Enzyme design. Sequence first.
Site, PDB file in Angstrom:
ATOM      1  CG  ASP A 294      -0.217   0.048   2.522  1.00 56.75           C
ATOM      2  OD1 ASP A 294       0.907  -0.489   2.597  1.00 56.75           O
ATOM      3  OD2 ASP A 294      -0.765   0.619   3.488  1.00 56.75           O
TER       4      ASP A 294
HETATM    5  P1  LIG Z   1      -2.446   4.366   0.409  1.00 54.35           P
HETATM    6  O1  LIG Z   1      -2.374   5.840   0.094  1.00 54.35           O
HETATM    7  O2  LIG Z   1      -3.482   3.625  -0.388  1.00 54.35           O
HETATM    8  O3  LIG Z   1      -2.929   4.256   1.931  1.00 54.35           O
HETATM    9  C1  LIG Z   1      -2.832   5.443   2.762  1.00 54.35           C
HETATM   10  C2  LIG Z   1      -3.499   5.219   4.112  1.00 54.35           C
HETATM   11  C3  LIG Z   1      -3.051   3.884   4.704  1.00 54.35           C
HETATM   12  C4  LIG Z   1      -3.066   6.333   5.054  1.00 54.35           C
HETATM   13  C5  LIG Z   1      -5.020   5.280   3.990  1.00 54.35           C
HETATM   14  O4  LIG Z   1      -5.430   4.318   3.046  1.00 54.35           O
HETATM   15  C6  LIG Z   1      -5.702   6.610   3.720  1.00 54.35           C
HETATM   16  O5  LIG Z   1      -5.245   7.374   2.877  1.00 54.35           O
HETATM   17  N1  LIG Z   1      -6.788   6.888   4.425  1.00 54.35           N
HETATM   18  C7  LIG Z   1      -7.548   8.118   4.286  1.00 54.35           C
HETATM   19  C8  LIG Z   1      -7.652   8.844   5.590  1.00 54.35           C
HETATM   20  C9  LIG Z   1      -6.276   9.271   6.029  1.00 54.35           C
HETATM   21  O6  LIG Z   1      -5.456   9.597   5.199  1.00 54.35           O
HETATM   22  N2  LIG Z   1      -5.996   9.282   7.327  1.00 54.35           N
HETATM   23  C10 LIG Z   1      -4.709   9.674   7.866  1.00 54.35           C
HETATM   24  C11 LIG Z   1      -4.877  10.451   9.132  1.00 54.35           C
HETATM   25  S1  LIG Z   1      -3.407  11.317   9.719  1.00 54.35           S
HETATM   26  C12 LIG Z   1      -3.192  10.479  11.229  1.00 54.35           C
HETATM   27  O7  LIG Z   1      -3.997   9.699  11.658  1.00 54.35           O
HETATM   28  C13 LIG Z   1      -2.102  11.029  12.063  1.00 54.35           C
HETATM   29  C14 LIG Z   1      -1.906  10.177  13.246  1.00 54.35           C
HETATM   30  C15 LIG Z   1      -0.632  10.523  13.980  1.00 54.35           C
HETATM   31  C16 LIG Z   1       0.125   9.358  14.515  1.00 54.35           C
HETATM   32  C17 LIG Z   1       0.422   9.498  15.967  1.00 54.35           C
HETATM   33  C18 LIG Z   1       1.756   8.960  16.359  1.00 54.35           C
HETATM   34  C19 LIG Z   1       1.714   7.835  17.330  1.00 54.35           C
HETATM   35  C20 LIG Z   1       2.973   7.055  17.388  1.00 54.35           C
HETATM   36  C21 LIG Z   1       3.697   7.238  18.674  1.00 54.35           C
HETATM   37  C22 LIG Z   1       5.019   6.578  18.703  1.00 54.35           C
HETATM   38  C23 LIG Z   1       4.999   5.277  19.408  1.00 54.35           C
HETATM   39  C24 LIG Z   1       6.387   4.840  19.696  1.00 54.35           C
HETATM   40  C25 LIG Z   1       7.365   5.927  19.349  1.00 54.35           C
END
Ligand SMILES: *P(=O)(O)OCC(C)(C)[C@H](O)C(=O)NCCC(=O)NCCSC(=O)CCCCCCCCCCCCC
Lengths: 114, 156, 208, 341, 77, 176
Positions: free
Chosen positions: E36
């Site tokens: 993906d």
């Molecule tokens: P491909 O482009 O087909 O796939 C892309 C993905 C998998 C992202 C999706 O298919 C997609 O595009 N979905 C549409 C909705 C979307 O893009 N959502 C993304 C939201 S941004 C997000 O959620 C940010 C979250 C931040 C992460 C937090 C960090 C936590 C980790 C802490 C560290 C742990 C140990 C260090």
Amino acid sequence: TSVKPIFSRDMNEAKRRVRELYRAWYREVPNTVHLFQLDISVKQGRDKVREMFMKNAHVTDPRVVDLLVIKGKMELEETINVWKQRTHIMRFFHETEAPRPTDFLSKFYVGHDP
Amino acid sequence: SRGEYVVAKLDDLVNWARRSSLWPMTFGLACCAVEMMHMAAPRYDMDRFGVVFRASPRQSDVMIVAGTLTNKMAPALRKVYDQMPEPRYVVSMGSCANGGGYYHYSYSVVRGCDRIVPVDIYVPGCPPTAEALLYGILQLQRKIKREKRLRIWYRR
Amino acid sequence: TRPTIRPRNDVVHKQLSAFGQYVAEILPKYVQQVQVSCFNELEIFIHPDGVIPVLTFLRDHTNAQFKSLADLTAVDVPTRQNRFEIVYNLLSLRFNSRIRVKTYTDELTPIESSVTVYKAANWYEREIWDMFGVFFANHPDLRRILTDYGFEGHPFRKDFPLSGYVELRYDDEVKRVVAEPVELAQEFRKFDLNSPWEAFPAYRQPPE
Amino acid sequence: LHHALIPHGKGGRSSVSGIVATVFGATGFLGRYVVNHLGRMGSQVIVPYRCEPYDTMHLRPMGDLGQIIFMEWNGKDKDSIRKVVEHSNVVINLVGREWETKNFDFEDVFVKIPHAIAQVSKEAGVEKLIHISHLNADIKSPSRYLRSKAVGEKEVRAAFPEATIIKPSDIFGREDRFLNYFASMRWFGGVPLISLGKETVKQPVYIVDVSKGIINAIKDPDAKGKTFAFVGPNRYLLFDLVQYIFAVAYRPFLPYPLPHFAYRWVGRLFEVSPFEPWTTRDKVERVHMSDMTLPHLPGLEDLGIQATPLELKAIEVLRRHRTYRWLTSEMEDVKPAKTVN
Amino acid sequence: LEAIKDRVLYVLKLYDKIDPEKLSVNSHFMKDLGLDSLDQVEIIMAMEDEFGFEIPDIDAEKLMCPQEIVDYIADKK
Amino acid sequence: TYKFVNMREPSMDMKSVTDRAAQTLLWTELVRGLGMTLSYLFREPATINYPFEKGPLSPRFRGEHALRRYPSGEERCIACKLCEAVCPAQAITIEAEPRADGSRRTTRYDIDMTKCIYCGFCQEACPVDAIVEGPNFEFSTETHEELLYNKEKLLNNGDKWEAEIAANIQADYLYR
Ligand SMILES: *P(=O)(O)OCC(C)(C)[C@H](O)C(=O)NCCC(=O)NCCSC(=O)CCCCCCCCCCCCC
Ligand SMILES: COC1=C(OC)C(=O)C(C/C=C(\C)CC/C=C(/C)CC/C=C(\C)CC/C=C(/C)CC/C=C(\C)CC/C=C(\C)CC/C=C(/C)CC/C=C(/C)CC/C=C(\C)CCC=C(C)C)=C(C)C1=O
Ligand SMILES: CCCCCCCCCCCCCCCCC[C@@H](O)O[C@H](CO[C@H](O)CCCCCCCCCCCCCCC)COP(=O)(O)OCC[N+](C)(C)C
Ligand SMILES: CCCCCCCCCCCCCCCCCC(=O)OC[C@H](COP(=O)(O)OCCN)OC(=O)CCCCCCCCCCCCCCCCC
Ligand SMILES: NC(=O)C1=CN([C@@H]2O[C@H](COP(=O)(O)OP(=O)(O)OC[C@H]3O[C@@H](n4cnc5c(N)ncnc54)[C@H](OP(=O)(O)O)[C@@H]3O)[C@@H](O)[C@H]2O)C=CC1
Ligand code: SF4
Ligand code: SF4
Ligand code: SF4
């Protein structure tokens, strides 16, 4: 109805910003493990980043995606500047909560929860 | 027995020194810390009893948790408590430190500093008066007077 | 004499009404409504994208020198389409007056940051974001100010529970503070205090 | 069940689990872990203690208000034992010393005390008894520790036929003896090993795994009168184990063979300390002894626990023994030790 | 270009989600290998970690094949 | 009106310049501060000899709580829950039922003293002077649970402190 965009116009630019933030978080996990002296692996941290990104994979609104990446940048800069402690970084992992049952029979046994 | 008498005298001497030389860490959180200042004031001079504020947790014997302990503050309080060397004691002061206080049903307040650190003395009030806090300190001193570590070790 | 009733100031009421008409005439493109409360407070309702022009006018105009930003907060009204109501309180020292400017926004609509008009807007808008979820577009450093690091949710929203969803404790096994779902030994006892008899006929709403 | 013993809540701090447990030896390593797990469940915990009340303070935050009760106890006083086990439906026994003092022997701490606890608990009507023993508990063992362990296991089974006897292999953790004892031999020059540690096989078990297994033995209804063996997933040679310990601690590893009689004399020298000894003759015997293999007894996988490998939790214990040069080194930097399976 | 190709293949083989049996110089990431967007992003980051040069987001989206990877690296030297 | 805290300029005559130079070279204001500290050294301290001497208090002081009785021995509380309704911190829990003789009396009257803010609202809202805040303030405990008072504990406090509570209420009841 036309609405004011936060960023990204359509969905493609929101996906681009998601990828940028994912790269920023992916390249930060070794530094986070080194600085916070975490007992987890770098692979575990990268997997947790992937999991936290994947639980918002159903969003189809570009403005919601922009707000999510804004909050992700906020919590990334809290990790980079060591504003967070090991407490929060390990709060990401729920290491102390007991595994909640998920099947009907077990949920029926334990209590009245749906 | 001779050994029992010797250990009893020795840990009477040891408890006397720790009781008579108490060094609270310079650590206050909220309005309850103003009554700490008034206990330090000339009226209820705490320096008479051997109770002296020290800034470094390494050179501190007692942690007086005087104020509200929030979710954003709990790690720092635990850190300074850990960095305090032993023997160390905890005196929670005021309703906020005892339980939740005025902010018990809050999303950002810890309902009791004893969820974070082992508390030896609880001082009630909002805020407890300087005399109430002094009574709590003297009660802590009397609690130290009853410790028998060498007596426990001899019979161990 | 009526010793138990607050005296009124028709002079100040008329002056505030006149100045409200003045600003409404000067800025028809943004000013939506002008009100003067019966305790002599002027309130201006403007379009959400007129924030920067209206505030700059009220700050720099010779006849309106509101050089001080007294306060800046928001109010959550879930029954509205635009639930969040941004409120600016300004103080004019030259004319010894105060003014209020109110705009509206919802979850997904940004509001222009007024840090270029007042420097206090920096921390005021940081607090608004942290406590309600309103995003401010051009903010030098927009992040949480009051809540814990990694805190999820905006607590001053009406739909946010009073005790939140998580609580903290020290776990001896992991040698660190942990966050676990909130569990109360005594539940907050909710009271129904409203009387079923109308108190103020002056504020009665039409049955509709 | 009594109306007050029915579980309620969601298994949190303020919930009710229906477990009323009297935990002997709760002022220790396994004791503190077990008490923490019980309080986290939201159970009623009774802590019999003979030490100074100052040494029980770490157990205070482990439970909600009123859920932890501290009461004095002797061990030679069946009256005190009954007083502390009267109102509990679970009794857990973790009492034990690795050395012998003037007043208590290996016979006293491993035979007399466990038998008294089991017999008194039977009279008091305690529903469940959990008794901790050792994996290498042999009647003909070279170690008085393990001989007393076997005799006490038989006595407890005789006194309380419905008991759950748990036999951990070697518990390693933050406050353990095992990893700390091996990692504290830096001060005495090199590392003395009998036959260079080439004739000893050990599979240590994680402390959290042991505590979780103790907790699950209470909840499981078909573990009433059974015996379990708690061992780790991998078996190591002693030389490889100590080498990995020193590699993780980033200390120079200088092993050397010391004959058994010489090591026994060394242990005899160190056991004259009135305080907690650094090592003893029985400790040397147990360290040299290879862990037994008991495939017939159930274990952690039977109680629902996946044993945590040492390579995942060794850095929690051994980071403290590192210097400033190597404090920040990550967990993956040291290759896992060579196993014998 | 042989050095670039073998380095790219060596990096790809170390990827856990990449099947070495199905891996080939013309294997499409999304279709042939079944990955993906985030997996391809991680692959691009791993490639950057190998050749030590910054690949922008816009160009990284047009690198769905190992042949495209080696072409991009050859063009950028 | 307003005043300037610091807008004075020094005279540049030779005598004043020499005086300022003598102050600079001979630390006159520092010696003055030393003299002030010496005066305070020779003054009498303001320290009381606690616990043998106590700081002054007033009849209105809000300390430990107490449930009072009528002179006949009957409890004053009538389970009206006004104190529970008015308690800011929700520190009071009340449960009641008809008694054997039909009286409206409480069965559970709990006050969480670690939740109470000692604001005195409960004794203001009581129409029978049942719940009061006594003069006691030296009641610190070693365990958290000991500060979770119940009806028996509060009645014992009332019986223990009834004389002083009655005297204080007599002294201060005409201001209420
Ligand atoms: P491909 O482009 O087909 O796939 C892309 C993905 C998998 C992202 C999706 O298919 C997609 O595009 N979905 C549409 C909705 C979307 O893009 N959502 C993304 C939201 S941004 C997000 O959620 C940010 C979250 C931040 C992460 C937090 C960090 C936590 C980790 C802490 C560290 C742990 C140990 C260090
Ligand atoms: C962070 O928020 C804040 C707070 O917080 C909530 C606050 O509160 C406040 C409020 C601030 C205040 C109230 C100010 C602080 C309060 C004060 C009172 C300030 C005053 C400070 C002092 C008085 C300084 C005192 C400090 C210390 C550390 C004194 C302690 C003493 C020692 C450390 C000395 C110990 C060493 C000794 C005794 C050496 C002797 C030892 C020996 C071994 C010598 C003997 C050797 C021998 C060989 C003798 C043997 C000889 C023998 C046996 C034979 C002799 C012959 C015989 C006959 C006997 C603020 C503003 C605040 O913002
Ligand atoms: C400085 C260099 C090192 C010195 C090494 C030791 C030298 C000798 C140490 C000096 C000993 C001083 C003992 C002080 C006795 C305390 C006085 C008395 O008041 O204490 C009473 C009794 O104290 C205790 O019962 C025991 C005190 C110590 C008993 C002596 C033990 C043996 C000491 C002599 C042996 C020294 C040689 C062996 C060690 C080197 C209880 O008082 P307390 O309740 O608190 O006061 C409350 C305040 N009030 C009154 C206002 C309410
Ligand atoms: C005329 C001839 C001479 C007459 C006098 C002779 C004796 C003088 C004093 C000699 C020095 C002290 C000797 C040892 C005292 C006993 C120490 C001891 O056995 O401590 C054991 C015990 C440790 O704890 P434990 O109960 O074993 O439990 C394990 C903890 N989980 O408990 C403890 O460790 C308790 C903690 C304190 C221990 C150290 C302090 C003991 C008392 C010292 C008094 C003198 C201090 C001098 C200080 C230096 C000079 C200023
Ligand atoms: N630790 C290990 O590596 C292994 C341990 N085991 C067994 O598991 C059990 C628990 O071990 P562990 O936690 O490590 O041991 P600890 O030495 O850390 O703790 C022993 C506990 O028992 C108490 N105790 C000891 N002797 C007496 C006595 N004579 N009278 C009263 N109380 C006493 C201690 O209290 P106090 O502090 O007051 O003295 C303490 O609470 C023991 O039975 C041990 O043999 C089995 C396999 C491996
Ligand atoms: S108990 Fe009262 S006085 Fe003390 S910190 Fe809380 S609100 Fe302030
Ligand atoms: S003094 Fe105030 S906070 Fe305390 S019980 Fe009375 S009403 Fe409640
Ligand atoms: S206000 Fe007085 S009478 Fe009413 S419930 Fe409270 S204590 Fe009882």
